[PDB]
Specification:
- Chain C: This is Large ribosomal subunit protein bL28m.
- The structure is cut from a larger assembly and holds seven protein chains of seven kinds.
- By secondary structure, chain A is α+β, with helices and mostly antiparallel strands.
- Chain A is built from two helices and six strands, in the order ββββαββα.
- Helices cover 25% and strands 25% of the residues of chain A.
- In chain A, a hairpin with a 3-residue loop joins β2 and β3.
- Chain A is globular, with a radius of gyration of 15 Å.
- In chain C, the strands form three sheets. Chain C has a two-stranded antiparallel ribbon.
- Chain C starts with 24 loop residues before the first helix and ends with a helix.
- By secondary structure, chain E is of the alpha/beta class.
- Chain E has one domain.
- In chain E, the strands form three sheets. Chain E has a two-stranded parallel sheet with strand order 1-2.
- In chain E, β5 and β6 form a beta hairpin.
- In chain E, α5 crosses α9.
- Chain G is extended.
- Chain G starts with 17 loop residues before the first helix and ends in a 5-residue tail after the last helix.
- Chains in contact: A-D, A-E, B-E, B-G, C-F, C-G, D-E, D-F, D-G, E-F, E-G, F-G.
- Chains F and G meet through loops of F and loops of G.
- Bound molecules: magnesium ion (33 copies).
- One magnesium ion (MG) binds next to loops of chain E.
- The structure holds one RNA strand.
RNA sequence: GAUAGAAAUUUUUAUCCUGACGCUAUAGAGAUAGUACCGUAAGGGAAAGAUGAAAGAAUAAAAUAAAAGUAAAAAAAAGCAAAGAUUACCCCUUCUACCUUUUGCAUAAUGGUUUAACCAGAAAAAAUCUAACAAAGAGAACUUUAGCUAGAUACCCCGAAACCAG
């Protein structure tokens, strides 16, 4: 896969935006895709169960779980239902919050 | 339904499904009302319109058609000037 | 366990060993070539590709030969490459009717034929197709020497061809 | 020095047991063709006739004498024919299994790097005393880059040893690393394996197989 | 980073003696033995279902079946000969260009789209190529020389707003297989055949200049380009004064499949060399 | 112990014996020779002129493409006649 | 239920023989060999079972298609009977349908 | 209707590396053998071995003495034969054998003298769980508006009168 070419203006008209030049100081890191996209996905189960998956997470995953809870708390009025998978590196959130999650990771620069 | 064929060992399909049914990509199955070409002079105009209407299939019938239909007919199809291309996808389904 | 060589080849490699290997190469080359005969009973179609009438599409169409049975009586004469046709049929030409085993037999005549090479009159049981092929090939001797093995299909015809071809060679 | 671009958030070094299990079970299972055929009641030699009448005999009713109820009859289900157990775990899972195997053997102090792999002699007792002095466990898997480039002293030393096995770099895999108590890598094998495993993270899906000639791939 | 490697030092050696599958990955099989699964073991009690002679799937019990009482109507009549076109959005195009999967410096066609994995074409599913769809007409900022098989007017207006080239070509399924997979054709050892003419139904879509057909009259092209600009309210750029005009003017012969190649040429990629015919009948055939 | 030599696919051309009855007949096809030229070509030892159709193949291709694939003027006049008839 | 009265000779099998030491060496031939050969052609076995897996009916059909003209008379008749029986049982018999 | 079902067009690299997550005398071929035996004939077709280095060590020595069946050792009011127990085997008290089929079986509805060895659930279209990669997935051919790939979860045995061909 070729590297993304350097553009004079960010964000791109396609909405793609490169990660920050240094790394953030929070005790976790979210790897980008092989297509250089945010690894936040949707999943449907039994036709009615809607879930949002944060993949490719290295570090303290409970810190990311806590951060997702205070980010999603003022919109729902309650804590989001989450699952931590440490042996895979995966956070799983009840509902479709994927666009907000990609946006939040976009200001956080991962 | 032949679940394992004798030549290729695959699962066959029944052409009586295809010759009168249409499968949308949402899982919905489309069909004609029974008797729309029979005895038009005897039936009323509202009954004629009701028989001329297309209708959907419910859950048990749709699963029966999906069981008797192979995986070739469940693919995503992009025909030129398809009238059902607008009806292929589902939207605003809050379940 | 299995064979190393297929069973369908067991006639072919039988020809590759023993007395058959010392048999002459021109005879082996004439024997190995299995060319299709002239269509006699079934009427073939010329085009390899045809338009489907119902479907209105291009399709590939192939000539499949109808199997014909040759009785041992046919080898004593010249039947024109035809014989008994064994098959099935439907009564009153409807598909949903009874299935019937049916044999079709050629019409036979006792005619005497003059060969100019042998200067002999042979009383041969012949067919009207054989007489038509004689008249088309412009001679009895011309008919024997012009029509090949798979079109003639007679041991008597092969013996006649061998005799007059040997006569012309000597 | 590392010949590949290391990501900025991770410093270079100087685990997936589930994927380890999947690759080990796949390596055990995919070569297996079970050779066990028993004869059902159609394939048994005789028994094509009713032994007695249906009614009036006084004993139980029977058809063939080769039914699975009888003594010498066939087997009702049994193992049927040569049975092939062939499945392919996908390419990225196999690459990840190799990666986590090397990571586990590095983290468990069983991975040792040896520069260019020479020996002063072909005596295997020298290898045994080297392993006992360094406490390399019982079994040692030595790797080399190519089969024909392997030094003759090392080859003659390992060809008569049971716990010491020498393999080319193309023959290194998860069953071998989990079988051998200590893994030994040479520096060009490290440089070869790092490229061959780190290529798959930035790769596409194959339109046609990679033996066919791609632009940037041989 | 991987803090499990710190705990892996204290644990004993990982071998084949201690390997567990993922908990939940294997649902254990249940066999018909015992009091829990016995004496009927899931097959019911007498009837036809325990003996396993129950009828076929569409059979409703002597009643005429639901799939046999509905009248026939052609829904899939001629579906195997209806023409299919895989869609490509301008959002997807701008995403590929902005990620560098495909480039605008080179003229872009279905070959480099497949090479950049933006679309996948299955010719044996009777696709005839790629149709441009107008989902991303507002946010498209790229300048392309795009070669597709079908186009819509909003996508065309969005491209020559930026100043690109839109033209639409026909491929026979043989030539389209060759187009999408050239290297599997290049290991076939066959000469490149001629690109075929469209059928009688597909003549007028490529004959009129409103759809930018290849076979259209080039004199009717600029009035169509200016009519689109008048209709959609954008100033029409002067493409002749651009520095990439020799790139944007690159076209194909209607009997030619690839860029820079000709019918009858044979590509020997082991020697990296090209074979050309010289026979007069061969040249007349592959140039006719 | 020492490992076995690795299985490697030879890049030399492979040619079956045509006089052997046990060889398959997809290995004796002209398509096989064209594929071997596309794979190696220089070391395959086949003529490059065998890849092109012969005179009879060119004549039958000319007959097929002349019969079933009409000229563009013929299609244009056919659609013009059809449009005139429907108008 | 009468079990044997003597201890058997214990099988001294070694875990480090040639086959157990060299088992599964080139399973990553493609992965570590710049893909040229698949793990398919490492499989030693029947002609019809090399790199293929299916149930009993598809196995019998594949055997009759590959080596059908090289089987024996009795084996070919038995395979035809097994194919017919498996076809009838797999199509016309079952619970879940 | 049940179902039957191509082709045009495509892919397939040579040799060695072969033995067994197949059985151990009711299993594996029927086989010690197509032999005894049953049949006029076509045909059907078995069961059967166990000491040791030496039996040119049979006043011969060494390891189980464990199935049903008997003997050592017949029985003492009363009861689905047992349990609660008890100083005490019974005597006291309390419980209508087991499967199958049934609305309902102690039923006088079926089956079994007992012991040993055999004898009967088998398929992954859709789905659930787990993993890899994810707008893409898969070691070619396909599926894609969170999807692709891999794995694990599934569907028995015996029984006719009969029909056709030789
Ligand atoms: Mg999902
Ligand atoms: Mg029998
Ligand atoms: Mg009988
Ligand atoms: Mg009785
Ligand atoms: Mg019977
Ligand atoms: Mg026996
Ligand atoms: Mg047996
Ligand atoms: Mg179950
Ligand atoms: Mg089961
Ligand atoms: Mg139960
Ligand atoms: Mg029971
Ligand atoms: Mg019952
Ligand atoms: Mg009932
Ligand atoms: Mg029935
Ligand atoms: Mg009725
Ligand atoms: Mg498609
Ligand atoms: Mg009916
Ligand atoms: Mg074919
Ligand atoms: Mg025996
Ligand atoms: Mg006893
Ligand atoms: Mg009492
Ligand atoms: Mg009662
Ligand atoms: Mg009941
Ligand atoms: Mg009573
Ligand atoms: Mg009774
Ligand atoms: Mg009773
Ligand atoms: Mg009863
Ligand atoms: Mg009764
Ligand atoms: Mg009973
Ligand atoms: Mg009884
Ligand atoms: Mg499935
Ligand atoms: Mg009948
Ligand atoms: Mg009947």
């Amino acid at each position: 896969i070729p590297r993304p070419p350097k553009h004079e203006h960010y964000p791109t008209p396609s909405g793609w935006q490169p990660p920050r030049d240094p790394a953030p100081s929070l005790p976790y890191f979210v790897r980008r895709s092989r297509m250089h996209n945010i690894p936040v996905y949707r999943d449907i189960t039994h036709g009615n169960r809607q879930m949002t998956v944060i993949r490719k997470v290295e570090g303290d995953i409970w810190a990311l779980q806590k951060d997702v809870e205070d980010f999603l708390s003022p919109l729902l009025g309650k804590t989001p239902v989450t699952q931590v998978n440490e042996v895979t590196g995966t956070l799983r959130v009840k509902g479709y919050f994927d666009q907000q999650l990609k946006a939040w990771l976009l200001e956080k620069g991962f | 339904v032949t679940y394992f064929s004798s030549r290729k060992g695959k699962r066959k399909t029944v052409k009586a499904v295809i010759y009168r049914f249409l499968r949308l990509h949402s899982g919905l199955w489309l069909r004609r009302k029974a008797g729309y070409k029979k005895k038009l002079w005897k039936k009323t105009a509202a009954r004629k319109r009701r028989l001329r209407e297309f209708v959907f299939c419910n859950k048990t019938q749709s699963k029966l058609l999906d069981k008797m239909t192979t995986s070739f007919w469940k693919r995503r199809n992009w025909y030129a000037d398809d009238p059902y291309q607008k009806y292929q996808d589902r939207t605003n389904l809050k379940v | 366990p299995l064979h190393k060589v297929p069973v369908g080849l067991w006639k072919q490699l039988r020809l590759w060993e023993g007395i058959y290997s010392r048999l002459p190469r021109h005879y082996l080359r004439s024997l190995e070539e299995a060319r299709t005969p002239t269509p006699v009973h079934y009427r073939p179609h010329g085009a390899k590709f045809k338009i489907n009438p119902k479907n209105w599409q291009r399709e590939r169409v192939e000539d499949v030969p109808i199997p014909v049975h040759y009785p041992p009586e046919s080898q004593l004469g010249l039947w024109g490459g035809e014989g008994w046709v064994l098959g099935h049929r439907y009564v009153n030409n409807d598909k949903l009717s009874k299935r019937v085993r049916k044999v079709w037999k050629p019409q036979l005549f006792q005619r005497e034929l003059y060969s100019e090479i042998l200067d002999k009159r042979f009383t041969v049981t012949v067919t009207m197709r054989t007489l038509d092929l004689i008249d088309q090939a412009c001679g009895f001797d011309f008919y024997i020497l012009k029509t090949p093995k798979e079109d003639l299909c007679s041991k008597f015809g092969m013996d006649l061809k061998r005799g007059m071809l040997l006569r012309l060679a000597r | 020095k590392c010949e590949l671009p290391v990501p900025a958030h991770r410093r270079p070094v100087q685990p997936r047991l589930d994927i380890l299990h999947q690759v080990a079970i796949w390596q055990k299972n995919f070569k297996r063709i079970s050779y066990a055929k028993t004869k059902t009641r159609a394939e048994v030699r005789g028994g094509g006739r009713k032994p007695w009448v249906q009614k009036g005999s006084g004993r139980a009713r029977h058809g063939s004498i080769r039914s699975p109820i009888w003594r010498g009859g066939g087997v009702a289900h049994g193992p049927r024919g040569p049975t092939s157990y062939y499945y392919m775990l996908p390419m990225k899972v196999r690459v990840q299994g190799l990666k986590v195997a090397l990571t586990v053997k590095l983290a468990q102090d069983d991975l040792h790097i040896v520069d260019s792999l020479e020996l002063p002699t072909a005596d295997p007792q020298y290898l045994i005393e080297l392993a006992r002095y360094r406490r390399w466990g019982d079994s040692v898997l030595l790797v080399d880059l190519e089969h024909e480039d392997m030094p003759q002293n090392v080859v003659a030393a390992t060809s008569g040893l049971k716990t010491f096995n020498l393999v080319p770099a193309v023959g290194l895999n998860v069953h071998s690393m989990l079988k051998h108590q200590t893994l030994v890598l040479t520096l060009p094998t490290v440089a070869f394996l790092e490229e061959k495993l780190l290529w798959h993270n930035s790769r596409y899906t194959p339109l046609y197989p990679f033996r066919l000639p791609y632009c940037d791939f041989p | 980073g991987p803090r499990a490697l710190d705990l892996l030092r204290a644990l004993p050696r990982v071998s084949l003696a201690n390997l567990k599958p993922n908990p939940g990955s294997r649902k254990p099989e249940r066999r018909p033995r015992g009091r829990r699964r016995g004496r009927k073991c899931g097959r019911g009690h007498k009837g036809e279902r325990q003996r396993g002679t129950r009828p076929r799937l569409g059979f409703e019990g002597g009643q005429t079946p639901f799939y046999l009482r509905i009248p026939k109507y052609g829904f899939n009549e001629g579906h195997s000969f209806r023409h299919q076109y895989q869609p490509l959005s301008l959002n997807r195009l701008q995403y590929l260009i902005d990620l560098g999967r495909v480039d605008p410096t080179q003229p872009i066609d279905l070959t480099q789209l497949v090479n950049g994995r933006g679309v996948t074409i299955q010719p044996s599913k009777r696709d005839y190529g790629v149709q441009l769809v107008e989902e991303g007409a507002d946010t498209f900022k790229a300048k392309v020389n795009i070669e597709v098989q079908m186009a819509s007017e909003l996508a065309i207006a969005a491209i020559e707003k930026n100043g690109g080239v839109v033209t639409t070509a026909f491929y026979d399924p043989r030539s389209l297989e060759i187009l999408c997979k050239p290297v599997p054709f290049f290991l076939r050892g066959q000469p490149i055949p001629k690109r075929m003419l469209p059928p009688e139904a597909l003549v007028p879509y490529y004959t009129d200049a409103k759809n930018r057909g290849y076979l259209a009259d080039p004199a009717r092209f600029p009035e169509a380009r200016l009519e689109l600009a008048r209709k959609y309210g954008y100033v029409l750029p002067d493409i002749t004064k651009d520095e990439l005009f020799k790139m944007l003017s690159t076209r194909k012969d209607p009997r030619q499949i690839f860029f820079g190649l000709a019918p009858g040429w044979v590509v020997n990629m082991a020697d990296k060399k090209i074979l050309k015919p010289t026979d007069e009948n061969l040249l007349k055939y592959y140039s006719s | 112990y020492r490992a076995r030599p690795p299985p490697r696919r030879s890049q030399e051309p492979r040619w079956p014996d045509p006089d052997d009855p046990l060889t398959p007949r997809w290995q004796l096809s002209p398509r096989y020779a064209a594929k071997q030229f596309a794979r190696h070509g220089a070391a395959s030892g086949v003529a490059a002129g065998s890849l092109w159709p012969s005179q009879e193949q060119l004549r039958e291709l000319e007959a097929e493409e002349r019969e079933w694939y009409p000229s563009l003027a013929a299609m244009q006049e056919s659609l013009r006649v059809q449009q005139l008839a429907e108008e | 239920f009468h079990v044997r009265v003597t201890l058997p000779p214990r099988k001294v099998v070694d875990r480090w023989n040639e086959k157990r030491a060299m088992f599964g060496v080139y399973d990553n031939i493609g992965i570590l060999g710049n893909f040229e050969k698949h793990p398919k052609e490492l499989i030693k076995g029947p002609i019809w079972l090399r790199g293929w897996k299916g149930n009993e009916l598809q196995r019998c059909i594949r055997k009759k298609r590959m080596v059908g003209n090289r089987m024996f008379i009795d084996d070919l008749h038995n395979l035809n009977k097994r194919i017919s029986y498996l076809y009838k049982h797999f199509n016309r018999h079952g619970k879940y349908r």
